[PDB]
Design a protein around this ligand. Structure first.
Ligand SMILES: *[B]([O])([O])[C]([C][C]([C])[C])[N]C(=O)[C]([C]C1=[C][C]=[C][C]=[C]1)[N]C(=O)C1=[C]N=[C][C]=N1
Ligand SMILES: *[B]([O])([O])[C]([C][C]([C])[C])[N]C(=O)[C]([C]C1=[C][C]=[C][C]=[C]1)[N]C(=O)C1=[C]N=[C][C]=N1
Ligand SMILES: *[B]([O])([O])[C]([C][C]([C])[C])[N]C(=O)[C]([C]C1=[C][C]=[C][C]=[C]1)[N]C(=O)C1=[C]N=[C][C]=N1
Ligand SMILES: [Cl-]
Ligand SMILES: [Cl-]
Ligand SMILES: [Mg+2]
Ligand SMILES: [Mg+2]
Ligand SMILES: [Mg+2]
Ligand SMILES: [Mg+2]
Ligand SMILES: [Mg+2]
Ligand SMILES: [Mg+2]
Ligand SMILES: [Mg+2]
Lengths: 217, 196, 226, 204, 222, 233, 195, 195, 196
């Protein structure tokens, strides 16, 4: 019984990248934790998301931060998101078959690239993209994202969209919940936008938005 | 389990250990494996305790009903009723039974019924897990028309060795003597048979 | 589960612990494992709880009808025979492991029975996950010609050995004494060596602590007149 | 795969001073997918209350079965069935399906109308009766409930105090179980009045 | 076939106070339905004001603790007797665990102590090395029985202020060392009642700026 | 990975006021066959330690050779080999525990359960267990295999906790051990009547008793037991 | 088969069901109607194992039609749903169970209310404002949780349904070849021929 | 991944490759380019197990680019295809084989001829006028067998390719989200941005 | 296979049947299972023919090299070399070997090495599938310090019974006598030992 279950997303927009994750960890039906940090702070400019194996994601994305630091010491220049995501994907590819479990979005914003997201997988997949959603509640979050996403979203509205999409998954997916962690990635680094308890957030959103009429409040 | 039945001049004697095991745990160290299906027709039981008890109870019922209608049954008849149950239910049974009895006409007789449900009439029979270790000893030491005292010694010495080597066998050595004189029960304790 | 049976001078005593478990969880702390088949025939049950209960009730019911039919007090050998044939028929799938004891016009009796239908006779017996701990005590302290007081002591000590040393057994000791020419005395919670200590704190909440959405009266009464 | 944890859910019952309480969550799911937040697991036949956890189709079937049987009981007996008698009926009915059982965890709660004595009982899926003095727990968060009840419970609680204890036992147990929650209901039962309260809880 | 793993039962509990931290654990050691020992210490003082417990398979648990204690010793040798901070110990333990990612230490590890600002700190680990700082964490057999109780009585979850009816939460007031020990004792007494692998004794290690103190309490032996 | 072939059953032990007692029977079983009747499973190390071993006998003989080699190695360049720098029970146990855990970690275990009984330099009683998994624990009473299920309950009635150790004499402790060995002979199908017993006392040293037998057995009541229920004759 | 959706609005129930039928490698048909009219104001859609779906639906249809003739009366949606549930609950412990999931959309003429019932092959019944079977709910429920109101019109219900189908067509790997949509209200059952 | 097609006409080679990427339940991307330029006049498309496909393609790309720099010369399509085959033939008896199927479309500047090579993960090479991997050939080869000529123009090749994609979109159960089409001729490699 | 080694007054005698089987087919009815690893150190082989031959050849090599350097090895030493091979390669070997030898200092010695690779010094040893059937007989009939003629009779009678009951044992009874006088080979045919 390793922990399992999650909802994580990341999307590119005019103002950079929004990263949003839930906080729940479950061993079977047993809820092990409601306070899990599913965004790894690789360095002040790069973020990674945790889905699949908790240790695998933690260990190797911290390690990735060490490799990124060594790169900029040697090259006297910020590492690209392309190069960083590639160091991780090449590493896990060496371990293919051994049983690593990883589904992560490597998120960054550089001069040459602009806002960039790479989905990296333990089976060796490396995909560049605009919107990614990974975890047991990924399908629920995709629905809210796809129907409301625009490139010209404001930072305020984009932050809410990411928050609202995790809430949707947290409500319906049994193995997602606890709290929502928000991040906004800019060229000058990521900015943390707080921890939001799903219990309190649900009722707040229900009243203000008029959604979840199926639920009595 | 170590069980045996031996015909001799005056009749037949049944012998058995008293150990019942669940794996390596001895669930009963004073078990009675020598079982009565008629006044002078007894059996030795090996294998499943449940199966051999169920069979013996059914046989006792059949022979009691036989007696009410047709008078005293032969030992061969008792063996046949055992066989019928063991053969027809071979898929679901784990029972190794030795049938032994005393008639006045036929005298002492022994029938062994192994797993398959076959019947074998013999001068003496050995069975159970512990019997393996005394095939050599019993074959070398058995004689026909032994006396009561000689037959008791033969069984005592034989089962003593079977007990010594077989983990599934142990406790006391029970014996039942079947002759014209009647039915005699004998018991022999560890301190007696271990020093042999 | 630890259950035992001990013969004595003028009768027989049986005993049991009171713990029931689902895996590593204790489902019931004060479970009753001593069952009445008839007024003076009682049995202790180990294994699957529903099965020991069900098989005892069924045979106990048929024993009662048999007693009424024959105008005779029931015998332990009848309960033994009916239980074993029922259990044998179900090929061990009815998970009942029983120690059957009692007094009847024939005398005092003590038997064990296993799920597959095999029976055993003895002066002292033990069944269940704690039977090895209990049997260790019985093999150390049992003797011939025990008194009533000595047998109760030995039986309860055997259960205690199971309570303390076997994780499948715990809580209290139940006893039933069946003496010849007397009413059987069922001693529920004969020993209570596992009372929980006082808690450090009281967890009584202030009223209005729990958030409530709706309140309503439930109509448990029937349809009313007028 | 495991029939008792496909749909999820929990039930808890407690005794107090001249009263009993029975409570349950409202979730019904298909493994990870939450399907309904209005699936009540507590039913009543006259003054006897029955909570049922486990496979939802069997929950529904058994309710319909015990409604069937208690209605015939009442017509023939000319009186409502009592908690002690109903407990035996539940046990008998479950055991008749010994080798093809309903995958459920029933819980009986009520007050005997003649003696006025509070009564609770629990069962396994095949009929074994657990007649506890203090409390009964059932469902996918039974371990959590055992932990809550064993610490929070004290004997002879007044109806309004008992409400707080059983509510907190359910809520906090449910919040540590993925397959339980999505609302909750608490029944407070006295000899001739029964109050039903829906609780406000986190909806994830 | 040979199974290199086993289950020795046991339950552990770490709570972080405002200026203190406790790490508690029962003293019972088991296999299947037998008791190996009624008093087998499970929580250890590892030096540098850090306490540790690795619950689950005891052979792996002893190995890990032994290797961590060794790591503290070599940290002093290599870095001029510098004190190993709790956060640095936590990261080091991750690498010890993940080093056997493909043949894991079959244990739930918890460490407790004080952070560099003097505030109480508890860290929790999974078998393969994922970790997290926490205010409250139970581990092992009876973890499922204890954590919901702690959510309610430490973090005041589902508790609201009377009169408001769900509108105002109960305020998160700080708990003293005496108050925490009461909750620990009641957690283990309740676990003992309903879990067969929990009992015999309760050993608590309390960490403050003054050092590491020990307290022992009896538990039911059935 | 292997399977045990020739095996030894229970080893039992307990602490008393001035030392420790340990015992084990002299059988080497080959499945259900009671093959070898003269196997010594208590192996003394010096005059202060006795290692009792159960399980695979071929692995026991290997461990026996390791301990013999350990004594030789300790004596090398050691003028105090028979004094301050002699082998302690704690040293011998930790060595074995290290080997057991290392061997399980290579998926090639020594298929044994071991109890190390002895007395330390300062007079303290030493009693600790280790097995094929590298699992270790200590207790006032320790037993392996069937002994864990049947001997411990009897020995724990004498010494239930730490405070009972000073109240327990060597006569009472030996009596309890000998009784436990009788109970194991009644109930363990892979046991023998013959056994060895060792006492390690802080005053009187190591006393090693060979060729002991289970005696004072109760079997007479067997004569009254007839049939399996209804049978009277 | 694959995707079946249901939504209960103010004055009607709307059922949407995919048109594709796939025999492993090939799509054999792209115009399959996965529904049966049980009574003039009751419609049942279905999805599950091949053969069982149609066989079960037609068996139910026959039984309800028999009841209608015998009593000269239409059963309520609640009554029909309970009958269907019992048949599935009976089926799950049979020698070979019906591997069929259904939605029952009906308009109760007595209460003047639309009603939607979701029943899976185990006999698990729930009354819902909106429902689905299989993986359909995983994509659509988040949209329905956001936009749904009990006072929605039929036209608003169809628009919300279009948004659900669009999300399915974007994120589902299987091509289900669109959906047939049917509306159940006071006037009976009709099909939306353009969707 | 899923569908990759190839056709060799008079003066060019055309490769068509699906855009979808599916992680089990969801379609994560609908614009994925399943190809790598090995040299100015050689293109390789690929499909197989996740990760292995891109890792293999990029490894081959690097090796051919290395050769180009070292010799200041472009290898013939035949030479590149033989190198790729040997790598896959080496791979199939490794500890963990590359689970990758490829098409290699190249224009030989020496012979002034287009060339299409089909190679599966075992290292099975064939030169073909048209080719495919997976289930793609099962639907398309009957159309190609009927319509194909060696003297077809590039425009006629694209029209025949459209007919193949239309048949796939009709009869395949999976939604592969259309195809990216690329042409390889004497002037090099270019992408058809509208298809 | 039925094999045994028995110490007596003047030294030790090894005994064996001559049957090699592939299932129920007798692949060799005149097999020599008594094998020489040194002048007066021999062994009885049971189990895999390939394994026990490979082991014996390696031991013979080791003892030949031992002799060139350190002179004649003891029987204990030979047993230790056997053990080392059987113990360290227990996962891949199926070999049940009895080692028997004659020193002038130590006289006749017998060491049995079962499947696990353990060593057991005994006055006499029995092994192989057929040995099971003569544990009783051998235990009752063995005495220490027997004469040559008595020991030959003991082995002949013992292996005769093992052969009689064990399907895997049969053919001739081979024997090798180890004393100060030298090395003597004996053979006994079916017509001789069956009538015993
Ligand atoms: B004997 O070993 O065959 C013995 C005879 C039986 C009639 C008492 N059988 C058993 O002890 C069997 C196990 C067994 C051992 C060896 C061979 C075959 C079977 N035991 C049981 O049947 C048994 C054990 N515990 C409870 C009930 N029954
Ligand atoms: B004892 O441990 O044997 C005990 C005696 C029983 C008759 C009251 N048995 C149990 O507690 C059994 C253990 C068991 C668990 C699982 C399958 C079979 C047996 N428990 C129960 O029967 C049980 C468990 N949970 C609820 C109700 N009953
Ligand atoms: B004896 O039966 O153990 C015998 C001794 C061998 C050294 C000559 N072994 C065999 O005959 C074995 C099989 C076997 C039978 C019974 C028990 C264990 C093993 N046979 C072979 O090794 C064999 C047979 N045919 C060809 C080659 N090898
Ligand atoms: Cl029996
Ligand atoms: Cl050979
Ligand atoms: Mg959730
Ligand atoms: Mg949920
Ligand atoms: Mg049977
Ligand atoms: Mg024996
Ligand atoms: Mg929950
Ligand atoms: Mg406990
Ligand atoms: Mg459903």
């Amino acid at each position: 019984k390793i922990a399992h279950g999650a909802t994580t997303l990341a999307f590119r927009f005019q103002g950079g990248i929004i990263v949003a994750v839930d906080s729940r960890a479950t061993a079977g039906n047993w809820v092990a934790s409601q306070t899990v940090k599913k965004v790894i702070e690789i360095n002040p400019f790069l973020l990674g998301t945790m889905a699949g194996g908790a240790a695998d994601c933690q260990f190797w994305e911290t390690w990735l931060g060490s490799q990124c630091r060594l790169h900029e010491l040697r090259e006297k220049e910020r590492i690209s998101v392309a190069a960083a995501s590639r160091i991780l994907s090449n590493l896990v590819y060496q371990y293919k078959g051994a049983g690593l479990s990883m589904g992560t979005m490597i998120c960054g914003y550089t001069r040459k690239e602009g806002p960039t997201i790479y989905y990296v997988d333990s089976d060796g997949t490396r995909l560049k993209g605009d919107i990614f959603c990974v975890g047991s509640g990924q399908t629920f979050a995709y629905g809210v994202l796809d129907s409301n996403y625009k490139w010209d979203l404001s930072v305020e509205d984009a932050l809410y969209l990411g928050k609202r999409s995790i809430l949707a998954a947290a409500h319906r997916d049994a193995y997602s919940g606890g709290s929502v962690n928000l991040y906004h990635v800019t060229e000058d680094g990521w900015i943390y936008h707080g921890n939001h308890d799903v219990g309190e957030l649900f009722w707040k959103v229900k009243e203000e938005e008029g959604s979840f009429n199926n639920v009595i409040g | 389990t170590s069980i045996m039945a031996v015909t001799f001049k005056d009749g037949v004697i049944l012998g058995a250990d008293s150990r019942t095991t669940t794996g390596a745990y001895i669930a009963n160290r004073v078990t009675d494996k020598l079982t009565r299906v008629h006044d002078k027709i007894w059996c030795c039981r090996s294998g499943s305790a449940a199966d051999t008890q169920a069979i013996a109870d059914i046989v006792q019922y059949h022979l009691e009903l036989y007696t009410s209608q047709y008078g005293t049954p032969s030992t061969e008849t008792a063996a046949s009723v055992f066989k019928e149950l063991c053969y027809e239910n071979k898929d679901n049974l784990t029972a190794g039974i030795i049938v032994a009895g005393y008639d006045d006409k036929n005298k002492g007789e022994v029938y062994t019924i192994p797993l398959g449900g076959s019947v074998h009439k013999l001068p003496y029979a050995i069975a159970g897990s512990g019997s393996t270790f005394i095939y050599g000893y019993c074959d070398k030491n058995f004689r026909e028309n032994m006396s009561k005292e000689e037959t008791v010694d033969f069984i005592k010495h034989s089962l003593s060795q079977a007990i010594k080597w077989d983990g599934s066998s142990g406790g006391v050595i029970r014996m039942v003597v079947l002759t014209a004189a009647g039915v005699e029960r004998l018991i022999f304790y560890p301190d007696e048979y271990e020093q042999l | 589960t630890t259950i035992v049976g001990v013969k004595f001078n003028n009768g027989v005593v049986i005993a049991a612990d009171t713990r029931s478990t689902q895996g590593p969880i204790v489902a019931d702390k004060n479970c009753a494992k001593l069952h009445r088949i008839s007024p003076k025939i009682w049995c202790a049950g180990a294994g699957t709880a529903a099965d020991t209960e069900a098989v005892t009730q069924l045979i106990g019911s048929n024993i009662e009808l048999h007693s009424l039919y024959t105008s005779r007090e029931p015998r332990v050998v009848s309960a033994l025979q009916m239980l074993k044939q029922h259990l044998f028929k179900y090929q061990g799938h009815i998970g009942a492991y029983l120690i059957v004891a009692g007094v009847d016009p024939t005398g005092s009796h003590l038997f064990s029975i296993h799920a597959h239908g095999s029976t055993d006779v003895g002066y002292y017996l033990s069944l269940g996950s704690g039977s090895l701990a209990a049997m260790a005590v019985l093999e150390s302290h049992w003797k011939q010609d025990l008194t009533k007081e000595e047998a109760i002591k030995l039986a309860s000590d055997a259960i205690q050995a199971g309570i303390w040393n076997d994780l499948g057994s715990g809580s209290n000791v139940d006893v039933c004494v069946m003496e010849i020419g007397k009413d059987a005395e069922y001693l529920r919670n004969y020993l209570t060596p596992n009372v929980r200590e006082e808690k450090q704190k009281s967890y009584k909440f202030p009223r209005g602590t729990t958030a409530v959405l709706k309140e309503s009266i439930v109509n448990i009464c029937d349809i009313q007149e007028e | 795969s495991d029939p008792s944890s496909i749909n999820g859910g929990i039930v808890v019952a407690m005794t107090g001073k001249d009263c009993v309480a029975i409570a349950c969550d409202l979730r019904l799911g298909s493994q990870s997918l939450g399907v309904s937040n209005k699936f009540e697991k507590i039913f009543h036949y006259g003054h006897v209350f029955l909570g049922i956890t486990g496979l939802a189709t069997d929950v529904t079937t058994l309710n319909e079965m015990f409604r069937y049987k208690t209605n015939l009981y009442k017509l023939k007996e000319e009186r409502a069935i009592e908690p002690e008698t109903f407990t035996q009926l539940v046990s008998s009915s479950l055991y008749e399906r010994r080798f093809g059982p309903y995958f459920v965890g029933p819980v009986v709660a009520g007050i005997n109308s003649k003696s006025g004595k509070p009564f609770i009982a629990g069962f396994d899926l095949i009929g074994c009766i657990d007649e506890a003095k203090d409390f009964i727990v059932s469902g996918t968060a039974s371990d959590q409930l055992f932990g809550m009840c064993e610490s929070l419970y004290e004997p002879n609680l007044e109806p309004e105090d008992l409400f707080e204890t059983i509510s907190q036992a359910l809520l906090n147990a449910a919040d540590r179980d993925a397959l339980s929650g999505w609302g909750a209901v608490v029944y407070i039962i006295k000899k001739d009045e029964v109050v039903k309260r829906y609780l406000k809880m986190r909806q994830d | 076939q040979f199974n290199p793993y086993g289950d020795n039962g046991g339950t552990i509990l770490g709570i972080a106070g405002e200026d203190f931290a406790v790490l508690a654990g029962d003293t019972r050691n088991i296999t299947d339905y037998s008791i190996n020992s009624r008093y087998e210490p499970k929580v250890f003082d590892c030096g540098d004001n850090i306490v540790m417990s690795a619950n689950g398979f005891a052979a792996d648990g002893d190995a890990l603790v032994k290797r961590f204690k060794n790591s503290v010793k070599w940290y002093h040798f290599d870095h001029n007797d510098k004190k190993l901070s709790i956060n640095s110990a936590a990261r080091n333990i991750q690498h010890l665990l993940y080093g056997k990612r493909f043949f894991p230490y079959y244990v739930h590890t918890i460490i407790a102590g004080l952070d560099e600002d003097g505030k109480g700190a508890v860290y929790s680990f999974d078998p393969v090395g994922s970790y997290e700082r926490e205010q409250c964490r139970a581990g092992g057999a009876a973890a499922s029985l204890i954590m919901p109780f702690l959510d309610n009585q430490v973090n005041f979850k589902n508790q609201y202020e009377p009169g408001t009816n769900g509108k105002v939460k109960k305020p998160l007031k700080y708990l003293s060392v005496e108050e925490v020990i009461k909750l620990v004792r009641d957690s283990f007494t309740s676990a003992t009642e309903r879990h067969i692998q929990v009992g015999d004794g309760l050993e608590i290690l309390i960490v403050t700026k003054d050092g590491v103190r020990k307290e022992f309490y009896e538990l039911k032996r059935d | 990975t292997q399977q045990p072939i020739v095996t030894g059953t229970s080893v039992i032990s307990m602490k008393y006021d001035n030392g420790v007692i340990i015992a084990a029977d002299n059988l080497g079983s080959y499945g259900s066959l009671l093959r070898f009747n003269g196997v010594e499973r208590l192996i003394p190390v010096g005059d202060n330690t006795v290692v009792g071993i159960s399980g695979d006998i071929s692995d026991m003989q290997h461990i026996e050779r390791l301990l013999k080699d350990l004594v030789t190695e300790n004596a090398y360049d050691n003028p105090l080999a028979d004094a301050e720098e002699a082998l302690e029970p704690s040293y011998i146990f930790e060595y074995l525990a290290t080997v057991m855990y290392q061997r399980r970690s290579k998926m090639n275990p020594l298929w044994n359960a071991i109890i190390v009984a002895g007395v330390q330099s300062n007079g303290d009683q030493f009693l600790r267990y280790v097995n094929l998994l590298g699992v270790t624990y200590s207790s006032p009473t320790l037993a392996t295999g069937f002994g864990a299920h049947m001997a411990n309950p009897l020995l724990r009635k004498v010494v239930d906790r730490e405070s009972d150790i000073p109240k327990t004499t060597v006569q009472v402790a030996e009596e309890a051990i000998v009784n436990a060995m009788r109970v194991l002979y009644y109930r363990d199908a892979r046991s023998s009547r013959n056994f060895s017993l060792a006492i390690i006392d802080k005053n009187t040293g190591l006393t090693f008793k060979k060729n002991l037998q289970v005696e004072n057995m109760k079997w007479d009541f067997a004569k009254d037991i007839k049939g399996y229920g209804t049978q009277k004759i | 088969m694959d995707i079946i959706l249901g939504i209960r609005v103010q004055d009607s129930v709307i059922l949407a069901s995919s048109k594709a039928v796939t025999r492993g490698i090939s799509v054999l048909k792209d115009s399959d109607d996965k529904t049966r009219q049980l009574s003039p104001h009751t419609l049942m859609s279905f999805a599950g194992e091949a053969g069982d779906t149609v066989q079960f639906a037609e068996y139910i249809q026959a039984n309800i039609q028999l009841y209608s003739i015998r009593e000269d009366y239409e059963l309520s949606p609640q009554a029909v749903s309970s009958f269907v549930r019992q048949e599935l609950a009976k089926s799950i412990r049979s020698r070979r169970p019906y591997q069929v999931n259904v939605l029952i959309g009906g308009y109760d003429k007595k209460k003047n209310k639309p009603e939607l019932y979701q029943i899976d092959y185990l006999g698990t019944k729930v009354e819902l404002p909106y429902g689905a079977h299989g993986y359909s709910g995983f994509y659509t429920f988040s949209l329905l949780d956001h936009h749904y109101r009990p006072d929605m019109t039929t036209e608003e219900g169809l628009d919300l349904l279009k948004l659900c189908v669009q999300e399915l067509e974007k994120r589902m790997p299987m091509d289900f070849k669109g959906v047939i949509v049917k509306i159940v209200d006071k006037d009976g059952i009709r099909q939306v021929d353009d969707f």
